[PDB]
Symmetry: C3
Subunit: 270 residues, 3 copies
């Protein structure tokens, strides 16, 4: 395993927007995609540049209670201070009892657990969230990578006319990481594209039973990811992604996946 040691900055970006970044002044919502391979360790020094108590907490990775990012376990970060969090991971292994301890690989995420409540309600509300991708040896890697977060009624905390436009060129391998947050229920749908409902979105063997889907529940705390080939079998153009809850899409949880020509040019019809 590789041990990586990074610094992340929690910053107030603007009114009611807080985010994580890899350099001072660099915070974004969603935060940076953090990538690991099974067995790797990530040591993160979280620098809290804000006037608020907040934290950093992951899903799916191995962390002990001192790294859990909760007030209860003394894992939060006071204003101006720095806390080291350690996230480990593992390849699968055989247990003494003969069962299999599964490797960490998956599309996971990280977020605030301390701001405004012991569940991080205000931190999550205001943007402290990002994707954590743990890969298995041999996995295919993307040309383009998009994080889509349905947070209450917002996509990536954008204003309601502002939903993110994600862009790829026809034929490129594109990875989507979907994360739900907040208090509302949602279904994430992508026009013109589909994926297998399993870890990677692609068939692992001849025996894989997983259904092909174009839509999946994305409720608070849930994450999943997949890869598609942009425009495969469907061509270039402006391809909608949206929450399929009708009241939600009508209020603006809908955005565009723009698939350009293979050469990067804008498709004629647009």
């Amino acid at each position: 395993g590789t041990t990586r040691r990074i610094t992340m900055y929690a910053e107030k970006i603007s009114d009611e927007l807080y985010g994580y970044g890899l350099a001072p002044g660099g915070a974004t919502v969603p935060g940076p995609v953090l990538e690991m391979w099974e067995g790797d360790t990530l040591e993160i020094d979280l620098v809290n540049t804000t006037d608020r108590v907040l934290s950093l907490h992951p899903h799916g990775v191995d962390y002990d209670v001192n790294s859990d990012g909760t007030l209860m376990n003394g894992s939060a970060v006071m204003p101006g201070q720095t806390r080291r969090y350690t996230w480990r991971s593992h390849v699968g292994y055989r247990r003494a009892d003969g069962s299999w301890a599964e490797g960490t690989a998956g599309y996971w995420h990280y977020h605030d657990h301390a701001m405004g409540t012991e569940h991080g309600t205000e931190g999550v509300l205001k943007g402290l969230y990002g994707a954590l991708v743990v890969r298995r040896q041999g996995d295919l890697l993307p040309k383009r990578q998009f994080t889509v977060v349905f947070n209450d009624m917002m996509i990536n905390n954008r204003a309601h006319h502002d939903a993110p436009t994600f862009e790829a060129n026809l034929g490129e391998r594109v990875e989507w990481i979907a994360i739900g947050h907040g208090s509302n229920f949602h279904t994430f749908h992508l026009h013109g594209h589909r994926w297998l409902d399993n870890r990677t979105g692609m068939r692992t063997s001849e025996y894989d039973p997983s259904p092909l889907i174009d839509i999946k529940d994305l409720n608070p705390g849930v994450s999943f990811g997949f890869q598609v080939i942009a425009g495969e079998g469907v061509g270039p153009g402006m391809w909608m992604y949206h929450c399929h809850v009708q009241n939600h899409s009508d209020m603006g949880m809908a955005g565009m996946f723009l698939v350009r020509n293979a050469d990067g040019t804008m498709p004629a019809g647009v």
Copy 2:
């Protein structure tokens, strides 16, 4: 692949009920079940017999932007007019990069994307939806087939005392296609019957891990299907299907699956 060429009519059935049909005056809610095998193409001339702008849009099948059924892509149908939509599909194939492009097979659906909003909110509300079943070579075929749509608080847009009664004879192979629509969350449950949670509802091989379930989330835009043997191991009788959200079932999202005797006669207890 087979290329089929059909005409579908969008019609106002009654006050606040719009549907699709395969012949003039023949519209139903839900609309006709459209069936394809992987590799087949369906060319649909949608005749809009109404005074409203509306469209036809699928999930899961290969369509280009000109067939997407959206206003944005110039794919809707003006009152009185006809639009040709083309839906393709494919068997699985090996990509140059060594991954597997999955075949289209699945329980999918189609609906309006243009009426009242660019998300088809009014069209879906009023009944323009139906099942689209794409089969894999070798799949088992049903004796009876039911489409169950949980649309907001309605089942198949029926009045609240009117939920559909579906009927089969003991021992028959019965296919259920479940579709969610609207703004509300639901869980679809069938008394006395169960299916494997995978594409077909049945074990694909000795290695299939899929759990056996009797209930599944059915939220807006989501579809799934399965087959069961009517009354298998449980006998004939009146077998409830319902949304398991308590407030919903109490307000009428519950209906009956009547399993008759093998010979079609009514079971004694009823």
Copy 3:
């Protein structure tokens, strides 16, 4: 198969709390975990000790309409009376048509279907629910077993400060059975632990595609279960479990999974 014959008592425990128990005065919320192996039969004499009409109804097992626990099928229990319910199950078998009838194994549940409404709305509201675990030959068995029910805004009908603390020793095999009930949507999440999303939570073969997850939708009527090794790779301590819907966790759907030292002693940090 083993045929077991038991008596269960439906009792009013306190104001607005009704539960099932295996002996007079022994009712609990959730009720007792009932365990079967595929092929076993359970005959239950339900003694209704209350002043209310109520019933007992399962998911997943084979029962005929006379055992369905509904008023419609004459399956409820009048105050003071006793009704025999018969629940069967089966190992998988090959059908004449060549398909496979799947064995009953799964994490299922039972609850009231007759109290206050024909859907058992009041009975479920007030605590008549419990886990039903049907095992496959060869399955691993737990040292500790917890039933977690998200019922409307309550966990196991506890007062909002009272969410259950579940305890295990480091390294023990722990089984969780999760059940949703009521009218609200939820996502069940466990800090520091993870499981494969399939029947048992553990890899069934080299070909199992199932993703590793730490959180899953738990909506009304839905059940699932899994096993984990307490503190595996993460150590002992106080490990939160919670609904990840932010408004819910903040109002108290959160509780503790206390992982003690291997020897049963309290970890230092606590």
